[PDB]
Design a protein around this ligand. Sequence first.
Ligand SMILES: CCCCCCCCCCCCC/C=C/[C@H](O)[C@H](N)CO
Ligand SMILES: CCCCCCCCCCCCC/C=C/[C@H](O)[C@H](N)CO
Lengths: 94, 282, 49, 57, 57, 245, 242, 242, 49, 48
Amino acid sequence: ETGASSNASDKNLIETRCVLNHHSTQETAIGNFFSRAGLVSIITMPNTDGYVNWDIDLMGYAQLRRKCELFTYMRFDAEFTFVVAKPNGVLVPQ
Amino acid sequence: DPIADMIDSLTALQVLPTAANTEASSHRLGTGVVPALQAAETGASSNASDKNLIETRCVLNHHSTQETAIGNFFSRAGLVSIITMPNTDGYVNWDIDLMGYAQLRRKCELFTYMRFDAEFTFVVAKPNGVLVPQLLQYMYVPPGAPKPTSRDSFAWQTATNPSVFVKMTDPPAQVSVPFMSPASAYQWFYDGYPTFGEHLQANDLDYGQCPNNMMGTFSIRTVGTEKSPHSITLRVYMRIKHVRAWIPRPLRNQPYLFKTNPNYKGNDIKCTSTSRDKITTL
Amino acid sequence: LLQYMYVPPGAPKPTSRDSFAWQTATNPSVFVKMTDPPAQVSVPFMSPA
Amino acid sequence: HENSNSASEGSTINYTTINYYKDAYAASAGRQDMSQDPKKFTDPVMDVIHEMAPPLK
Amino acid sequence: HENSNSASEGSTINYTTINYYKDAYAASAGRQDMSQDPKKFTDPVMDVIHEMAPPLK
Amino acid sequence: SDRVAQLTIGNSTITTQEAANIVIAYGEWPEYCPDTDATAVDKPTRPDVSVNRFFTLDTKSWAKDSKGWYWKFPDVLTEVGVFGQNAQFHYLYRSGFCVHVQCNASKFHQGALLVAVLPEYVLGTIAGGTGNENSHPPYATTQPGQVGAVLTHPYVLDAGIPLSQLTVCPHQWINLRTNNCATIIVPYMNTVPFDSALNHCNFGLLVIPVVPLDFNAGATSEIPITVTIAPMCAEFAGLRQAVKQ
Amino acid sequence: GIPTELKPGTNQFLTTDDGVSAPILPGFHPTPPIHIPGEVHNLLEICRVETILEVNNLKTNETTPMQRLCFPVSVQSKTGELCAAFRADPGRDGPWQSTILGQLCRYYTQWSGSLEVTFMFAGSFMATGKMLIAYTPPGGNVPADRITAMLGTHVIWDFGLQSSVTLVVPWISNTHYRAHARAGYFDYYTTGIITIWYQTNYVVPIGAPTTAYIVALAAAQDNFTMKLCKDTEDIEQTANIQ
Amino acid sequence: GIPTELKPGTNQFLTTDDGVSAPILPGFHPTPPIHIPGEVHNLLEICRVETILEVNNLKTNETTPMQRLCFPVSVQSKTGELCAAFRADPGRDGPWQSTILGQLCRYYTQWSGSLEVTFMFAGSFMATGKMLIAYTPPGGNVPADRITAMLGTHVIWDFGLQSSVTLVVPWISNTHYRAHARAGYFDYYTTGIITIWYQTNYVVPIGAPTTAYIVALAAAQDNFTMKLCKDTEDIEQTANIQ
Amino acid sequence: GIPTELKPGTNQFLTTDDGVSAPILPGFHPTPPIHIPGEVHNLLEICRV
Amino acid sequence: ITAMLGTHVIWDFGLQSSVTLVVPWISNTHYRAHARAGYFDYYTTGII
Ligand SMILES: CCCCCCCCCCCCC/C=C/[C@H](O)[C@H](N)CO
Ligand SMILES: CCCCCCCCCCCCC/C=C/[C@H](O)[C@H](N)CO
């Protein structure tokens, strides 16, 4: 009821041995959790006059949206990659 | 202390960059000293040398032992997979099992345990070897992650899964893969069952299957929403780097039949040697 | 796409286009395209003498 | 400075390695260590056998 | 010398960064800092609770 | 005078007067798990006398056309003594072994046995003969208990690997003109510090007659082979109710 | 210029590759940061926070899902009955899905370390009782009776002025890390079974209700780690958002 | 940017090339290594281990292949007969194929160094005898009689309490390394012929059997090396695995 | 990565160009040289005969 | 297989024609009276 988590450990509940463990905590740091490129937009030019104006809203795909909404506030730099092809995946000189 | 009974390796390493020199020796006549007579029942190999059996000269040889080190023996890319997209909806989910091609399988099964980093190369073309401008995506799906069900599945958003986008007219893609077993090494031989329970005859497939070697699913697709008219053929090659190996084994003398068991054709047992007619005539 | 393989004396040589010897698990091999630049490799002195 | 995450931390030799990334498993293989202990496969017996003595006297 | 314009000036570790431009936000991510303060989410109480004492006496 | 030997551990003693050396497998003695290699946090139990003692199994009969026998470890001892009770009440186990194989005959008999230890001895089948069936060995074959099983194709060791290079493993010979026993001390070999005793077998012991048994009519034709084994540094952890398999 | 050669891996886009890309705004400077409370640096700070375990995850509870957060305890006629039973696997489907530890485990492939389950009694002041909360290592199913279940790791909980108890689930495994348990070959990675039994009865006087409820909370210990970050399987997207 | 030029060898994939490739998992750390017995660092540690030589590799032995591991010795009527004869080529087809040295030689092109063959007598205690084991350098075929064969390197073996003898095959070659011998031009690289003869008879009393067997074991010496690692010719794959 | 520009002379094969190419055999060591009489280092030694 | 669970010795025939089985003092009391059929089977030593 105090709002605090439990502070009981292994050594106070059972009889333990000595374990010297070297398991790293590097991968669960939030820099490693977020530095992965995920899809934020799919833009198509079938919009038949050869241009699209897309209003930037990156909350349209559920996988990166659920990762970012674990927190309330976030401050970061970004890196955007533009993978372009035909609707069937073929590439042309254009 | 009132209770008195509660008070309470053989060999080492050495750097040998070259093979051993030969010393000069002369004749020897006498009793008691017999270096040529051995005892193979002790389990030890023979310790007799050149200089104790014949008269030798001095040879200073500089033959290097670098190429037979297991780092040089294993750091060669060999084929582990061939994946085809004729599987007619534009994607393949391939369960990662690298024991499907006999040349790299026999090299790795010389040892029982192995711990290494890998390097994977993806050589992609058409089934006749021609290349077209075509965009592809390779995704690694770890065990527990959702695998794609179609070409336009949500799992291709790859927000946390590692993914490579590549073209067919590009050079082949290369990635580095770490050691990712939950144990301390990969084992090619696991004598036992993974789970508890009764072991009936209908569940005999479970014998020999180690989940510490199961690494997940490798998925490929053509990127666009619409169907591609090109057939795909992907060949995967693996180099083994930063390797450690334990417990050498007999090398296999029978042809492989299946990917997960040491089963052999029992009607044609191959002899390890080439036969001849008489023991006295070569 | 082409593949060049060096087969040392004693090694199995390929008998067809889909032979098992093209798995090149220990033999040195080069994969190259025809529209690429020409391939270059370095070869040591490999005589028994 | 790198993450020290390589499959083998030994038998790669002092230095003699090349890397361009922050992960140590991305590095090249380098030249191998030439250490070897053959006597734990050839003479793994409790009482040592001398070469010139009769081995079962 | 760079423009000091990066989203985070902390938790990127000493050095361990690569850049080829005059803007600091163009740099790579580097290896992360392994600092953590778990006790402001687990024990955020005014009077501290010892492990062995009864927590509501 | 190193042909005589005495092995005393626990409340048991083996004496032999016609012996070779003792083989210590890979040059390593069995040990308890150190704190740097351990991962489980609960304190393990070490009974130290009631489990570290010599255990004698059933006895085979060497005939003139015997193929060979194998045993699986520690499957041979999971129903025997206080070791078999600690292996059922606990989830994790770790120990080394001292294997001793006995076979005596007269000075007018001849024959040679190869006694080898092969870790992770995974068995195969004949795949239906023609090679088309994906057959698997039954549970009585992969874990035969303290009785053991017979090899069907000893030339390929029932696994597709030849007998002729089984001596790359820790081994001894029992040559009937030279010695009557073989002794191998095996450490704990696994990719994990502890493992299950009912689900996993660390190594297999193989006893194969390479030179067949021969004698003239009138001599003793009942030549038996006995296996006696001892755990060395047995540890147990993960205590829960008894599970037999 | 300088002689160079291009290697395999040229012109590929690896989504987890960390490099330097060209900036779009020269001379730009961001808004200065102010101090905001509650900064997170590592996901293991969130994993140590206790969140509610859904032990009462029944098929009859799906239309009234607020009842899945508490399970009942009542006056018994026979002795030694079990109240509840669930697996200790945090990444498996079941009661651990409702925790923030069991949700952040789904973003990783392997885990290691000790766990903790806290049970909080929400009955009257006038109610008394004793419970036996046991943790069984792998090897069997749910124990049949109380005398089988107490052979493993257990704690005896007495109701009183301290309304909570902690059952620590210690790391007892063969491997250093555990993948997520699943039906099939991946039952090799199972953790075990947590059961709760009646040590004595739930005793109550006249005028106080004969049924109370227990809330179970779960977190991780300070030796807990995760590795091999991957995609989760809880969110999906079949239809287009907006 | 920096002026560069691309050279030949660009965009090739050489399978034996050693370089740096991009990692897929940032911040990943492996499982820590534990101590496992029996670590190998060099393949020459395995080549010094004695394994069984299949001297009795007859065409009549192919359906009972356990008889290929031992060859007989019996009571003779005439003197000076030969018991067996085989080549000393470890990489050639024949008796050396069944050894782990003759199997690891097949992964390399050239070899150098001295060899050793150990013969172990598996008869009765009451059996006596003397054998002559000779090694002949190249130049001829199998010697016709015993007085021709003893002109080379030989050892006279007396049966007794030590049941084994070692014939060392010394490195006597023109080149520093030998390629594997073969019918054709590659008979330039032949090593020679090992023959075993009766020095005296196999003598036996009444009541002990008149035929015994010898097991031959073979390994390499400490001046043994191999070079030019290549594909082996022992395994094949015509049909698809699984 | 590092900003670069490709110059003329790219993807050409000049037969007299001296450069570094990729080796095919890692860890290979040649046969040691012995002393042979009559070594030539320069073609002007032959021209004086 | 039941009898070897106690104190035992394995005896090999050879040039030494004798072996010794030591029967160690394993008792509850410090002294033993002589065993007999009845109440005095409390003082029994065991079976060889
Ligand atoms: C040629 C360069 C084109 C790339 C321009 C990209 C600039 C846009 C970067 C915005 C960074 C994220 C800002 C917030 C995104 C989300 O949509 C909002 N939170 C909406 O809720
Ligand atoms: C985009 C990157 C895709 C590449 C992902 C590759 C990860 C898989 C690496 C596994 C390393 C070998 C693990 C064991 C392989 C064998 O199949 C097992 N031993 C089966 O017996």
